[PDB]
């Protein structure tokens, strides 16, 4: 397909590894550091400055300050998940609303069938097919963050013409307890 054949020609495939130091204590990062799951109760971890202590979020290890990049995330049959990018300088301690104004550019799924972009106010997305694998695409220069169905190459959503200045991290959020993990596809 055009999506599969062109993605690497236009965007550098990012090797995204989850950073355990950033993960909310209720989250578990897999040994290979590609997958995240949720625990029933928060685990005993230090409250280091890099760690999200309220939001059930985890970041990638590396940030982006220029260029075109992409990564793909297997969401599978999960009924809840949110993914995208956030500023290096987001508030990690306490609560702030996950919005572009607060340095979060994310979309995802809640309650099995409610697809949303986490704008302010939130925008409901109408998708003909439920995505099982999502491609996250960053063009730092043009200020575009795009989301695609990584199987059929269909468009999900684009944050357009954002004035980037700070470094951007891949960000992942899961709120629910379910049998399927959220998994990054390797380069």
- List the domain range (segments joined by +) for residue 58: 1-187
Name, in order, each residue with C-beta under 8 angstroms of 130's C-beta and a sequence gap of 6 or more. 113
How many domains does the chain divide into?
A: 1
The span from the first CA to the last CA of the chain, in angstroms, equals 18
Give the integer Cα–Cα distance in Å for 13 and 150: 13
CB neighbour burial string for 2-28, b if at least 16 within 10 angstroms, e if fewer: eeeeebeeebeebebbbbbebbbbbbe
What count of Cα atoms within 13 Å lies in the side-chain half-sphere of residue 69?
Answer: 17
CB 72 within 8 A of CB 150: yes
Q: How was this structure determined?
A: X-ray
Data resolution in angstroms: 1.6
């Amino acid at each position: 397909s055009a999506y599969n054949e062109w993605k690497k020609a236009l965007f550098k495939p990012a090797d995204v590894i989850l950073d355990p130091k950033t993960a909310n204590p209720i989250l578990l990062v897999s040994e290979d550091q590609r997958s995240v799951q949720r625990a029933k109760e928060p685990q005993d971890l230090p409250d280091n400055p890099e760690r999200f202590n309220w939001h059930y979020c985890v970041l990638g290890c590396e940030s982006f300050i220029s260029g075109r990049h992409y990564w793909e995330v297997e969401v599978g049959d999960r009924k809840e998940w949110h993914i995208g990018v956030c500023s290096k300088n987001v508030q990690r301690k306490g609560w702030v609303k996950m919005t572009p104004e607060n340095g979060f550019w994310t979309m995802g799924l809640t309650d099995g069938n409610k697809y949303r972009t986490l704008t302010e106010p939130r925008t409901n997305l109408k998708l003909p097919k439920p995505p099982k694998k999502v491609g996250v695409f960053l063009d730092y220069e043009t200020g575009d963050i795009s989301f695609y169905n990584a199987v059929d190459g269909s468009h999900i959503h684009t944050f357009l013409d954002v004035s980037f200045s700070e470094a951007l991290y891949p960000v992942f959020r899961i709120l629910t307890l379910e049998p399927t993990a959220l998994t990054i596809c390797p380069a």
